[PDB]
Amino acid sequence: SCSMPLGMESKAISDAQITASSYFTNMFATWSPSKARLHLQGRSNAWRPQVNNPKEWLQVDFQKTMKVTGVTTQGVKSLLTSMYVKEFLISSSQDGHQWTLFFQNGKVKVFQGNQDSFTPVVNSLDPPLLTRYLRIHPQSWVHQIALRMEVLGCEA
């Protein structure tokens, strides 16, 4: 009863609500944070950071506190090239300035992500995370960091 998609795919979460540490742009494509939407199609249809390293992150601002019970991630296949995140961390904030890593079994939880560029993977957050802001922190990837995502949950 608390697993509704919050609005990445539907665009109920607007472009302005999605930001990142950096993003990759060249003459071919512009992989801006607001392209990180589950199942999005087109030339520029995922977020990619400017460099591939675990210092990079993607942020969503719900604009109020929500109850988050899962995240869904997907990579992207750009032309003939596969790109996906294999493992990631999650951090959260109410105020947008002080952040907390999501913990499980005594330590920072390393979420197991994708195994291809096109199939979604759902990761449960238990206990649920009550938060206004979410950040995803890629830790390992195939070829390049690329993400499309959805957030699952309900009202706080």
Side-chain angles (χ1 to χ4, degrees), residues 7 44 57 64 66 68 114 143:
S44 297
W57 48 260
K64 66 183 171 202
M66 302 300 283
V68 175
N114 293 288
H143 197 238

Side-chain angles (χ1 to χ4, degrees), residues 10 26-27 32 36-37 43 51 76 82 103 117 131 134 145:
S10 71
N26 59 15
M27 302 195 198
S32 62
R37 297 180 181 279
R43 157 83 58 100
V51 292
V76 80
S82 298
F103 267 58
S117 304
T131 196
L134 206 63
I145 297 171

Side-chain angles (χ1 to χ4, degrees), residues 43-86:
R43 157 83 58 100
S44 297
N45 67 326
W47 171 67
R48 293 174 60 185
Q50 76 179 343
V51 292
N52 300 304
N53 117 95
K55 84 196 176 188
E56 303 294 326
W57 48 260
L58 179 70
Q59 177 179 304
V60 184
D61 179 7
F62 308 130
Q63 293 175 285
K64 66 183 171 202
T65 303
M66 302 300 283
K67 180 178 171 169
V68 175
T69 62
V71 287
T72 308
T73 60
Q74 183 176 45
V76 80
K77 185 161 173 182
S78 182
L79 306 183
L80 308 181
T81 300
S82 298
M83 300 182 279
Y84 60 90
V85 174
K86 289 192 291 177

Side-chain angles (χ1 to χ4, degrees), residues 68-127:
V68 175
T69 62
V71 287
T72 308
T73 60
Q74 183 176 45
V76 80
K77 185 161 173 182
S78 182
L79 306 183
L80 308 181
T81 300
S82 298
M83 300 182 279
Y84 60 90
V85 174
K86 289 192 291 177
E87 292 174 302
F88 62 91
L89 320 175
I90 292 174
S91 70
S92 59
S93 186
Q94 317 299 326
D95 63 12
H97 313 115
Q98 66 183 109
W99 297 82
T100 300
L101 285 161
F102 190 90
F103 267 58
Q104 199 170 299
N105 291 316
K107 63 184 194 300
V108 180
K109 172 66 170 175
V110 179
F111 293 90
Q112 298 301 306
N114 293 288
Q115 293 154 306
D116 68 13
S117 304
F118 39 84
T119 308
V121 168
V122 178
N123 264 289
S124 179
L125 282 73
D126 195 49

Side-chain angles (χ1 to χ4, degrees), residues 7-9 11-21 23 32-38 47 57-63 133-134 147 149 151:
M8 299 294 280
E9 185 172 357
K11 299 182 168 74
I13 294 167
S14 77
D15 290 352
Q17 295 173 251
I18 308 160
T19 58
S21 51
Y23 65 95
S32 62
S34 63
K35 299 310 186 81
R37 297 180 181 279
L38 208 74
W47 171 67
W57 48 260
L58 179 70
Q59 177 179 304
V60 184
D61 179 7
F62 308 130
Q63 293 175 285
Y133 297 85
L134 206 63
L147 22 69
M149 6 169 289
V151 183

